[PDB]
Amino acid sequence: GSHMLEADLELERAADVRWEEQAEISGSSPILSISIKNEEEEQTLG
C-alpha cells in the first residue's frame, strides 16, 4: 500500500462549547467568533 494518508482531513477550532444566553433569550444567536470574524470561508483552513 501507501505510507501517505489517503485523505487530508484537518481540524479547525471554531467555538467554545457552552450554553449561549442570547440564544435562550431570542431562540437563535450568532456566536461571536475571532480580530472579530465576519464571515466563514470554507475553502481556507482558518
Total binding residues toward another protein, as defined by CB under 8 A: 33
Using the rule CB under 8 A, is 35 a contact of another protein?
A: no
How many Å separate Cα 2 from the centre of its chain?
Answer: 31
- What span, in angstroms and rounded, lies between the C-alpha atoms of 15 and 23? 15
Cβ contacts of residue 15 below 8 Å, gap of 6+?
31, 33
Closest contact distance (angstroms) between CB of 46 and another protein is 9
Using the rule CB under 8 A, is 17 a contact of another protein?
A: yes
Q: Please report, as ranges, the residues that interact with another protein according to CB under 8 A.
A: 5-20, 22-24, 27-31, 33, 37-40, 42-45
